[PDB]
Amino acid sequence: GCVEVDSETEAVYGMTFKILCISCKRRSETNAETFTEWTFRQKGTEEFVKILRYENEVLQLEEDERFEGRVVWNGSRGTKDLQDLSIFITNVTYNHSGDYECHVYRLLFFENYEHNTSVVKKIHIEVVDKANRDMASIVSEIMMYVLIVVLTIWLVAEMIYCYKKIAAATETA
Amino acid sequence: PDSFKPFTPESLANIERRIAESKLKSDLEAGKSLPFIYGDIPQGLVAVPLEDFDPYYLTQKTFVVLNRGKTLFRFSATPALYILSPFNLIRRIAIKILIHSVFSMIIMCTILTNCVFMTFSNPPDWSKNVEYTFTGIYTFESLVKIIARGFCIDGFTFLRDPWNWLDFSVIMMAYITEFVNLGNVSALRTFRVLRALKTISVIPGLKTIVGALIQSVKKLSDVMILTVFCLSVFALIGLQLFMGNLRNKCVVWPINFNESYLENGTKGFDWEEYINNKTNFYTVPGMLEPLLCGNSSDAGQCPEGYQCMKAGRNPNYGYTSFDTFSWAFLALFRLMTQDYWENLYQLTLRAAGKTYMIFFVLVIFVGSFYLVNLILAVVAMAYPYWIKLKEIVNLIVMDPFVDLAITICIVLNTLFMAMEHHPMTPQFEHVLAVGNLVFTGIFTAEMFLKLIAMDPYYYFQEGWNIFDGFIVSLSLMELSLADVEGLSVLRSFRLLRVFKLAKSWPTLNMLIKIIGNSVGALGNLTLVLAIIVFIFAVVGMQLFGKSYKECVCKINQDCELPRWHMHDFFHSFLIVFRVLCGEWIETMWDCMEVAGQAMCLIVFMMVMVIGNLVVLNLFLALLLSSFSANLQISVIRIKKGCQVNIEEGLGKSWWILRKTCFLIVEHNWFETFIIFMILLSSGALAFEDIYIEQRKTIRTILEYADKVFTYIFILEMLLKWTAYGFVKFFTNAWCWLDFLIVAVSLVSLIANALGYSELGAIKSLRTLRALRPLRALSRFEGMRVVVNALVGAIPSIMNVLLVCLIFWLIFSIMGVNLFAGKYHYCFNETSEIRFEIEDVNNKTECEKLMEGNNTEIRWKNVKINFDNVGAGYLALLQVATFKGWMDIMYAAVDSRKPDEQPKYEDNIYMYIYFVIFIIFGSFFTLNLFIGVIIDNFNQQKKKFGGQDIFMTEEQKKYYNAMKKLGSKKPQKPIPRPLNKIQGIVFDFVTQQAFDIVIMMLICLNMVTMMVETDTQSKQMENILYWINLVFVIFFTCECVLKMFALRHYYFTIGWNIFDFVVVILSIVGMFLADIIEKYFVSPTLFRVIRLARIGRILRLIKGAKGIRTLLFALMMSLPALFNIGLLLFLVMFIFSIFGMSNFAYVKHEAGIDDMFNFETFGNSMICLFQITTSAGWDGLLLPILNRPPDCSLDKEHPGSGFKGDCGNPSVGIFFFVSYIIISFLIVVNMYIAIILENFSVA
Amino acid sequence: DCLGFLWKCNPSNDKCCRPNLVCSRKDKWCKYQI
Amino acid sequence: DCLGFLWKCNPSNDKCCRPNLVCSRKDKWCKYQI
Amino acid sequence: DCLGFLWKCNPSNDKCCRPNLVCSRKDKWCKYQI
């Protein structure tokens, strides 16, 4: 089916990055016609500005030196019923740090009835010179070692204590 | 003895004097053979009036007649019609005819010819001539009785036998109506079917069976009272919880006031017409009913632009609902009998939320407790050259090798026929033809040689010989005649040779005994079932035959008959046979629409009740009858022609080291710790659903914790190795299983660390983590005992399992010969209509429509079919379980020659193949299985010597204590307060009258709840609030009053605390309900809080001595059912994880939809519980069987790395078949457990 | 001569076919004694 | 041949041997004359 | 006239005497009819 997932936040300078924009419709068996527009606010700037528009399986890129030649489609393809609207940056630079908005305009076609929807997804991307490791992996890596050792010393401690008792009893008689 | 004398007038005169003497101051009955003591009738004293043979009422004005069969008759000596005296020749001639057997045979043959004529929907014109012949015979039969005995005079006369009432009514009704020649045909047509009931009185030995079955009813009144009471309690629970939930619908929202035209026009708006216009609701494309929804977070979702509201009418023409007690009561009778309960299960969950699955788990469990009582209620009542050549051939025939070789050829021949399949290459077909030719010659030569060996044609003809000789003749004629080859059924008779093995396979022979009894000892009981089904088929056809065709547009969209109807006898019979299999709700909806509810409900329930009662009696009778009681020599002639000392330094240390390992491992602290981690690692498997990408953090944590868990279990294995030693460790299966799971985990760990995480073999080895919960089987002693008991019965189950496989193999081969390659059909995908024979007749025309870009035309095949023996076995399993058998049956009756387009019901008489299989492969086969399971579990219990086998030692002492607590009768203290006022109040509150007032007022409270309806007006709701308020006030006064007399002795009685604890729930329930209705609104809590009032109704158990003794018997089985329930949950949990790993992405189709699927642990458990009752397991397997173009191999799933939505048919079949078998074995042990407690209680 | 599975029988000298069947003191018809 | 006495009929539509047996709306049967 | 009532035959070649004999749809020799 379709599962909405949020994009990663930190993009490494010099290499690629994928900005996820997934918006699943409530009932999957319905059919609709969707197109998307992306708007971008760079760090140190206040107003959002459009950067590209995708519709009818053809991507249109706005005139922007910071984005020209290094943005390609990465979402749903081969259909007009788009549910994945991601874009792929082939070369991340510090111009790309800022707030993004992924606007989705979806028109649903029912029997003698059509509903024009609209959804806006927000993404905040920060650019770094080197990849970092998430805390969940940092904290868990040490924890499995603490549990492993703390359980290993516990086992031997009981063995020695019971070894003391059993050996003493056997030698008693 | 030996005293005979014609009844002369002086005999009557003596009688009337004898009565004067008696008044002034016996196994020999009519209709029974005369006892041997009296000897044979004199040479000329037969068929005349005689004197009575007994002193029993010897002085009555009575005389006796005899028959040439030595049967006895009794008559009243008073004249018939005040004219025909016994001494007149008028009586004598009719007496000689009435008693004659030939006279009865004519009547029996008359009714059988009459009942066959009732099967005609529109009889020809000449039927009237035959119709008047019957009435001529029937009217004559009555006359002989009237002229031979009195009409209605007291004593013994025509009308004093109740069966002659029907006979007289049948005859007179024909005269008054037909000769008047006016009436409502469909109304009085049914009274004629009463003629069929004449078979009961005419055929010998059927009157006793029916009389016993009628008196069989009065035993069940105790359980009928129980069943109705409990069904009403759960109907009130279900009514309260689900008022109006089944008419939630997705209606277009918001309202477009500009585009709205009410029916009156004027471009206005009217709300009542808005939520009743069907066009405003959402219907999933391809479905027949609008979609349900719910405002809860776990209920169904509406599309964008729709709102979830109560609109329209309830599903299934309005007959499926909880809006009213009557409709709620029906919905729970359906749930009790498990007829199509998965649809009610799914509809309720889609509107009330998935969290309400607990209600259906509870109702299904208790509903199984009713059935055990019902089964036990009925069980309690059944419980030259000629000589030279002849000797030469006879010397080789009858030799053990000749018999042994021919027996092997029978097995080899059967395996040869299983090789037939479709599509089959010309070379493969040629081998089958040549091989089959040889086999017929071998058996033909065998019978010819044995025909010569035994004197020609005379000594050979005996039981088995005539059969195989008939087969040989049939095969020879089939080889010669094309007309014989015309019909496919003839090849099946070769399969019957497989039973020739019964003489050497006792278990197979045990199946012949069961089948033989059904037409042997129990023939009359079986014949009653045949007559009962025939009458219902005719009765329903007469009442509803017209309606199904006049109102056809009401129940089918195309204005043509459905596939199940009562418009003719054969289709009427099939419906009656269908309800006997347990499917009555679906066919009753159609009948209610056309023929109304009152008359349709009545008849359908009588068939369900009377029909199942007779089937159950036959099934139990067969079981109790089952409980009644040179290969080697031929082989013999073929055979003829290190060990370090412990008493030393290291020996003490090393031996002590092993001793301490044992101490730690066995220590209860260590074992409990390990059990805690088996549940922790097993519970970590449930987080691997389709939403794992949204849980990046939890995925990381559980990934690392897997290292900790697998490290700990490695240490546990090493400690057990030293503590026990390799010899002891590798000797018991429980330690072997724990070793295997650890080894698999290590392989996936070191391999993962090395790399190759994307390897196909490793990925398919990762899915084996679902078996980790099996490590808990030996840690819980409840699970171990149940598993040990199940394994002990495996050797017995296998021997009967083989008979099931061989017996089912014959039906699988026979079905292949009839339906192999005949399930294909040409389908227009874009418009979804199977082409008619005019358009495409065969595969060739379908292909010619596929030329060019016509990608919408497909030559499809039914997924479950008889294309080969392997596929036949799956189809038979779906028929035997009555799940998915409708699609299999529909394709069979439509089938034509191979590679031909199906035509609607072109082969309608193919239904008989499935009728025969159900009777033989399911009804009798299940009889054989239960026959050994009951016997085996008695020997298993006996040889162990214990009273229980599903219970642990700790539970046994608790079980023993509970038995005594239910046997020590309570005392009767009378602690009078010795007070002026409290003395009198104590006296009357303790009188039986005071209890009767309480008991009756609770019943009025119960009825006050049934009056509630979803659509009730406010005024009715306003009234029903005050009435319920009074009952609360009255019942609290009862407690306050008794708590004023028995101030401190209330605790001494177990029911008063229940009365008190049920009371304080009533005041809080009503007072808090008002509070939550104004502040802190929470309707879902309001309904649940209101359920506390039903506690009062449970107080009826206090006085219901009839039902208390069974509710107590339930408590005895709970400790045993808990152990079995645990094992079922473990199996459900293991199969639940397998589903999520395999079927989480298959296409949403058939039985897989957006709420009931394997995408999540909750969804998998919901589906797995549904299958546990084997309910709709065909609709869940079908999507898994898809192959492209039915599915896409590279479909995208946004938010996931998975690709494709195709299933794996091989895994799908293994997954569902394995669970169906396993759940059947466990559930069968559940019934045996509860039945054992009830048997030991009764 | 014999009485059937559900035939009414006389407990005193019941003719229910042995060893399978026996008269019912309470129901007055043959039952399986098993 | 003809429809018999009290045979099914309408007041002007009987197939009976009328008027000897002839129709009436009170019974729609060719009641025999007497 | 006709051949013997059993003779080898093949589909799409009705060499057996007509119309009495017919080639079988299972095996390679002709068939009788009544």
Ligand SMILES: *[C@@H]1O[C@H](CO)[C@@H](O[C@@H]2O[C@H](CO)[C@@H](O[C@@H]3O[C@H](CO[C@H]4O[C@H](CO[C@H]5O[C@H](CO)[C@@H](O)[C@H](O)[C@@H]5O[C@H]5O[C@H](CO)[C@@H](O)[C@H](O)[C@@H]5O)[C@@H](O)[C@H](O[C@H]5O[C@H](CO)[C@@H](O)[C@H](O)[C@@H]5O)[C@@H]4O)[C@@H](O)[C@H](O[C@H]4O[C@H](CO)[C@@H](O)[C@H](O)[C@@H]4O[C@H]4O[C@H](CO)[C@@H](O)[C@H](O)[C@@H]4O)[C@@H]3O)[C@H](O)[C@H]2NC(C)=O)[C@H](O)[C@H]1NC(C)=O
């Ligand atoms: C799940 O949760 C969901 C959300 O919680 C929940 O959804 C809710 O469901 C309920 C029903 O179950 C909905 O309630 C109904 O709403 C209907 C529509 O209401 C709106 O329209 C009304 C009529 O509009 C006229 O008046 C307006 C004001 O003057 C004008 O603007 C309109 O234009 C129009 O006037 C003129 O203009 C038209 C041209 O434009 C012209 O054609 C037209 O003819 C006319 O001349 C409004 O009155 C109404 O406003 C009221 O309600 C909203 C909140 O809903 C308030 O904010 C307002 O302040 C105001 O109070 C809406 O704008 C209603 O029609 C409907 O009412 C009728 O039925 C109820 C009983 O259900 C009666 O009590 C009521 O009196 C009405 O009775 C009608 O029939 C009776 C006969 O039975 C008749 O005697 C009477 O005269 C009348 O004809 C009802 O309230 C609700 O809206 C849904 N949403 C929400 C958010 O609540 C869902 O049910 C849940 N599902 C489950 C399964 O739990």
Ligand SMILES: CCCCCCCC/C=C/CCCCCCCC(=O)OC[C@H](COP(=O)(O)OCC[N+](C)(C)C)OC(=O)CCCCCCC/C=C/CCCCCCCC
């Ligand atoms: C004296 C006392 C002694 C007691 C001894 C112990 C007795 C009781 C226990 C016995 C152990 C039995 C276990 C046998 C299990 C074998 C299952 C098996 O080998 O399956 C393997 C297949 C492989 O799948 P794949 O790689 O093609 O998938 C590919 C999917 N991709 C592509 C996503 C990777 O799995 C699949 O197909 C998945 C679907 C099929 C699932 C089959 C059933 C599995 C579960 C069994 C539970 C048994 C519970 C028993 C409880 C007690 C009863 C008495």
Ligand SMILES: CCCC/C=C/CCCCCCCC(=O)OC[C@H](COP(=O)(O)OCCN)OC(=O)CCCCCCCCCCCCCCC
């Ligand atoms: C390791 C595995 C174990 C391997 C062994 C398994 C054993 C069998 C395999 C399959 C049997 C079990 C499957 C099953 O559940 O279906 C049987 C069903 C149980 O209850 P159901 O609710 O399913 O059936 C509806 C109850 N009303 O029994 C039935 O009634 C079958 C339906 C027959 C009754 C309908 C009318 C027939 C009556 C007349 C038939 C004889 C008349 C005499 C003619 C001469």
Ligand SMILES: CC(C)CCC[C@@H](C)[C@H]1CC[C@H]2[C@@H]3CC=C4C[C@@H](OC(=O)CCC(=O)O)CC[C@]4(C)[C@H]3CC[C@]12C
């Ligand atoms: C009691 C039950 C378990 C019986 C099971 C019998 C199996 C040994 C048989 C029955 C059905 C058979 C299957 C039926 C059809 C096919 C398709 C067949 O496909 C082809 O041969 C490819 C196309 C071609 O013919 O060239 C491959 C074998 C297979 C899976 C067969 C494998 C062997 C199966 C599973």
Ligand SMILES: *[C@@H]1O[C@H](CO)[C@@H](O[C@@H]2O[C@H](CO)[C@@H](O)[C@H](O)[C@H]2NC(C)=O)[C@H](O)[C@H]1NC(C)=O
């Ligand atoms: C559905 O709504 C979208 C906007 O929510 C419509 O797109 C706008 O259409 C207007 C013209 O009516 C233009 O002036 C805007 O520039 C459009 N905006 C965007 C972002 O495309 C769209 O036309 C609507 N579709 C229908 C069928 O009503």
Ligand SMILES: *[C@@H]1O[C@H](CO)[C@@H](O)[C@H](O)[C@H]1NC(C)=O
């Ligand atoms: C990005 O562009 C720079 C030049 O500006 C180039 O050196 C580098 O290789 C590019 N990397 C990627 C991943 O596109």
Ligand SMILES: *[C@@H]1O[C@H](CO)[C@@H](O)[C@H](O)[C@H]1NC(C)=O
């Ligand atoms: C990014 O911003 C700098 C600011 O000076 C500008 O020179 C440059 O052209 C922008 N784009 C890229 C790709 O660096």
Ligand SMILES: *[C@@H]1O[C@H](CO)[C@@H](O)[C@H](O)[C@H]1NC(C)=O
């Ligand atoms: C995203 O773009 C990259 C650019 O090379 C491509 O390799 C990748 O397949 C794209 N992903 C999707 C989902 O289209």
Ligand SMILES: *[C@@H]1O[C@H](CO)[C@@H](O)[C@H](O)[C@H]1NC(C)=O
């Ligand atoms: C129906 O329409 C007619 C025509 O305008 C009007 O006179 C009448 O009042 C309308 N009735 C209702 C109930 O609106």
Ligand SMILES: *[C@@H]1O[C@H](CO)[C@@H](O)[C@H](O)[C@H]1NC(C)=O
């Ligand atoms: C239902 O609504 C549709 C759409 O406005 C209309 O065409 C139709 O006539 C309505 N039917 C009724 C019965 O009101």
Ligand SMILES: *[C@@H]1O[C@H](CO)[C@@H](O)[C@H](O)[C@H]1NC(C)=O
């Ligand atoms: C299949 O159905 C479509 C839709 O009705 C129709 O246009 C098409 O002609 C049909 N195909 C054939 C072969 O008739």
Ligand SMILES: *[C@@H]1O[C@H](CO)[C@@H](O)[C@H](O)[C@H]1NC(C)=O
């Ligand atoms: C198919 O049917 C057509 C008539 O519908 C017929 O002419 C043709 O011979 C048939 N072909 C086969 C192979 O059955």
